[PDB]
Structure formats: structure tokens, C-alpha cells
Design a binder for these strands. Sequence first.
DNA 1: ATTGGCACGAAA
DNA 2: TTTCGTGCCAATTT
Lengths: 376, 48, 50, 79, 99
Amino acid sequence: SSIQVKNKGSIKLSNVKSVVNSSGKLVITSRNTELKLIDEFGRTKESYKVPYGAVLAKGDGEQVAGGETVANWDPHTMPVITEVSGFVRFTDMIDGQTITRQTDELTGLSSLVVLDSAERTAGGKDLRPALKIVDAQGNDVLIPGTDMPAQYFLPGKAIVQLEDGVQISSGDTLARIPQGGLPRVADLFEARRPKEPAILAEISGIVSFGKETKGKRRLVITPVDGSDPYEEMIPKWRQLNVFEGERVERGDVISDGPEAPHDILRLRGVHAVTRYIVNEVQDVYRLQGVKINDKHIEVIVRQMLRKATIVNAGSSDFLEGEQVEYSRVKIANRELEANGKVGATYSRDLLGITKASLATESFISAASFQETTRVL
Amino acid sequence: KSDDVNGRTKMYKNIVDGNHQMEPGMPESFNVLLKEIRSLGINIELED
Amino acid sequence: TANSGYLTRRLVDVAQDLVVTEDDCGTHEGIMMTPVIEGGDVKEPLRDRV
Amino acid sequence: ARVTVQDAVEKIGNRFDLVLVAARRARQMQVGGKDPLVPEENDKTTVIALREIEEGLINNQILDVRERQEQQEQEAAEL
Amino acid sequence: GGMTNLERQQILTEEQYLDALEEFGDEFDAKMGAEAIQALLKSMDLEQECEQLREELNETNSETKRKKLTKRIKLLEAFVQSGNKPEWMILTVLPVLPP
DNA sequence: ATTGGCACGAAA
DNA sequence: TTTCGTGCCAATTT
């Protein structure tokens, strides 16, 4: 429901993009904002995650006491609140092709409901409904700190709250969108991908949609100074959480769910994946009161990270896409660097314990482990 | 202690003589494994 | 019991060849260690981790 | 008798090298004709070697020096 | 295949083989059993295959075909670098275990 | 039973 | 003509 602090201390916000609403409170427009409780000594004691579109009673650096609500938000409803204050005009908003008119029977407080591409007509398939924030003169009000005009798109199953021609302000919701044990350790050490993985971003920059329902939906990422034509395939049947009007980083999620360790290794590095594995294993073991040092899990993770994939041949004899030993690549690169040449470049690979133990350089040990016929 | 035919006899003789030393040798099961793998048409051998 | 035995056998197999064969490698890389905090409770202090 | 080997480990510095040095000394005292450097009290060669190592009378360098001296003396007295 | 329109690895049937014999005669050779597989393995040149596969790999663009070509090239290179020969996978003499 | 690799079939 | 999904087979279980 809401964050309830337990002790007294200062409040700190990490990765926060928040603005003051009309009522005077603070609303967060950043997905990866984290709230921390740091006392006067400087040691953090409590940490929480603040969802997108939440109201903060206090600000950064303010002093709070125990038993106090610091943040509040609606869990089932995802706000699409704005930053600039002005009138709302409907662009590419046509009834019977992209939206529908449904009136509440009892409450009587209802407005147009934005339809989805799976229900709306074909004519509205190529049309993107949007709400544009303007001033009393009708001109587009540019967002402070930027130059692009302020317009927000609306996905499917969006219930518009306020009708056209009604003044709004910052923090006002335009629309509402409704929503262990031994095997766990075995899956963690085998690096098995979960049934419903979490969908991440490969490159940074602004994000946008693409062709709709071409088998499955598509996404496009345009970096500020990177490679624009990159694109990704993402099914639309899963509840997405991307912001087409906000820039996303490669260390950010698109959908939600359990995250595959391979993606973590590919996108964040060795330290992130080893920390994730150690933390998961220790979380599993701690509930039973078992005390195990982290050195053992660290050496296991190190043994899992024993393979590399070449990304360019370079001066070495390694071909374009063969999987080889990391130590051999390091030895070859340090030997070539002393000759004035340029070494090859590689990407680390993550293997499960069963798969990593079958890829050793010694065939006697591999045949002793299992799958004797194939190894021999 | 298990499968070195010459090593067992040498260790027993040394123990009876008050010399607690051993000559390890090669296990016989490894030779059996080598023969069985060779019977499958695969050339496996020790070198150097 | 059988699952525990299979897991420990795989763990032994994957790391049987790792031995301390040096005194210092001279590296400067490392990992950052911080206390484990979940919500408003600290389950693991920094002392037991470093 | 012996219940602990901590002092011998501290003298040598490593548990793995202590075993090798003690085995070398015990084999010298058992198969060879060497006499103990400490007053033996119904003890076996391994315990006697451990007690010698604890007192500081036996280490790897001392054994190497003794072997070199014995070889030189034998080669000199051969003629 | 000879001068006829039969490839070097086409799979025939009994009626098809009889028709081919009655039409073309002895201008083509067709076999069955392990002898045919040994003949196919013995007449295959490894360097030319490696070079042709490398040309096909570097020219065309694909994902699954690229992986298949890479795997076959790796197998061919493994055969070439070692002293083994492809026809040794067909047994002619059978070892016998000691009694 | 469970998991993963491989050939096959339908679709962009 | 490529690309992802579905059915089949082989591996594993102190």
C-alpha cells in the first residue's frame, strides 16, 4: 500500500526524477527511484522501492520520525500524470476507430475508454491516440529542461478520467490502467531461465513502439548518439511497463518478472551476476538458520564463469564465433600485447554447473562425471 | 590396499620387515578400462 | 536425500580442480561489500561479510 | 605421547611441509641407523621426530646440511 | 552420378533403382549398406569442402544456416588437424577382449 | 517425471 | 526465403 518508516532519520532518494504537483506535494516520474533512511552517522538502515507515480509527503534531506507515512500511491492503478500544467487537447482521438464511449450505470462519473489494437478497427491500427498539453493560447507548452513538445500517448485499456476542455495540473491522473528450498538452489546453480523472464533493454536512449500485432509487438530504441536502427521483438500479451515518452537505460526493465542470470551477465557485468547469485543463495539458506560463508558461493560462481566467446578474430587465431577458455584468451592477449600487436575481444559466458563441468579441457574427468559415450 | 598386485605384496613384505614405506604402482582397473575402451575400436594409450 | 546428494556431487564435480596455487596475483579489482538490508530490517551486518 | 602438534606447526610454519619433514626424519631414524636427538620415552619414530622438530633441533635445512656433510665424509673416506 | 541427372547422394528405392538400371544401364553406380557409406566417406576431399563451406559462410547472411555451416566447418577442421581419416568410422576389423 | 537439444511445420 | 514454435528423442535422478 504505502511505505511505513519504523525509526527516525534522514531521507535520501536515488535515481529520482520528481516534480512538485499543484497541491504542493512531490510526485516521482522515474521508474528506478529508491528511498533510503540514513541517520546522522551516515549509515543506511532502511531501503524501499517507490513505484512510478507516487506522492511523497516529504522531500530529500528532510527529517522524519518512526511510525510515519513518507510515500503513498495506488497499487492497482498506474498513473500517467503529466509534468507541465495546461489544458488537454485530444489528438488522433476518434470514437469508433480507436476509443469507445462507456457510461457508468451507478456512479455516473465516466468518460471515453481507449481501446486496444486487438479490439479496435483496422483503420485505427495505424493511428496513435494522444493527449497534448497546451496553454490558454493553444500553443504547445514545452517541458522545462527540454525542447520537445509535451504530448503523451495512451495504450489500450486506458480509462480517460477527465473529458476534453477541462483544465488539469501537475500530478493529475489522465487515465487509469488496471493490472524456495533445495530446488531453488538447484535452479540457481544450474542457471536455468525462468518460465516468464523479465524483459530488459539492450541499449540506452529514447524508446518507441513499432508495427503492431505483426505476430507479436515490436519495440524500437533510439540512442542519442548510438545506432538508431536497433529494434527488439516483444510479445504484447504480457503486461508491459515501458514509457514511450521517457528515455530508458540498458540497465532498466521493460516488463516485470524474474530476471535471467544470463541477461544480468550480458548487460551489467560479472559483479552484478555474482552478487545476485550470492544474495539469492544466502536468502534461501538464511530462512533455516544455516550459516555459510560467501567464499564458497563465490568460488562456485567463478567456476561457472570459465568460458568466453570471441567477438572479432583480431590478430589471434581464434575464429569469429567459437567458444573457448577465458584463461587461454587472457594468456594470448597478454602475450600479444608485449609484441606491439592488438589482442582479440571477448564476451563472458555463463554456464550451469552440469554444463560447465562437461566443458573442461580434460576428457577423463568429463567421462568420469556423466555422459561417457558422447564425451568419448 | 585395493588393486595393485605387486604393491600389495611389497607393502606386506615391508610391514613384516618393519619398514613402513610403499611403492605405489598402477591400479589394475585402469588397465581393464583401457582394454575395454580399446575393444570399442578407439585408440587410447599412455605416452611419454 | 537423493536430491541433496545429486546437488553436492555436481558441486564437487564443477569445482574439484580449484587449488590455491599462488600467494598474490597483484590485481586491483574487487567487489563492494555492504550490509544486507531488506525493507526496514538488516539481516546481515557488515562485520560478518568482510 | 602426543595430543597436539601446534608447536611443531608454528616452528615449521606449514602443516603440509611438517608432515614431509617429520616423515623424512622418522624414516632416517627407522630404516637408517640414526639415533634420536631427544631422550626417547617409549615413543615411536614419528612422535620422536615431532618432538625433535618442536625443540628446534630438526628442520629441512638442517637435514640437507647433515646429508651433504655425510656424503662429503663418505666420499672423502672412500679412498 | 555420371552423365545422368542423378546427384552424388540421392536416395533411391528398389523400383527407382530398377528403372534407372533399365534406362541408363552402367553409366551410374548405386550401392546400399555400409559399403556405400564407406565409399562416400573415402571419396570426400576435406580441404575443398572446408574452402567451399567458408566461401558459402562468408558470402550469404543467415542465422541457422550460418551455425550449421560453422559446426560442419569445425568438424572438418577437427578431422583435418588430427591424423584420423573419415573412412575409419566404418569397421573392417573387430577387436576382441582378452579372455 | 524433468530438462535440453534437434528436426519439423507454420508464419512474417 | 528466414524465423519462431511444436513434437520427438536422449540424458538424469544417495
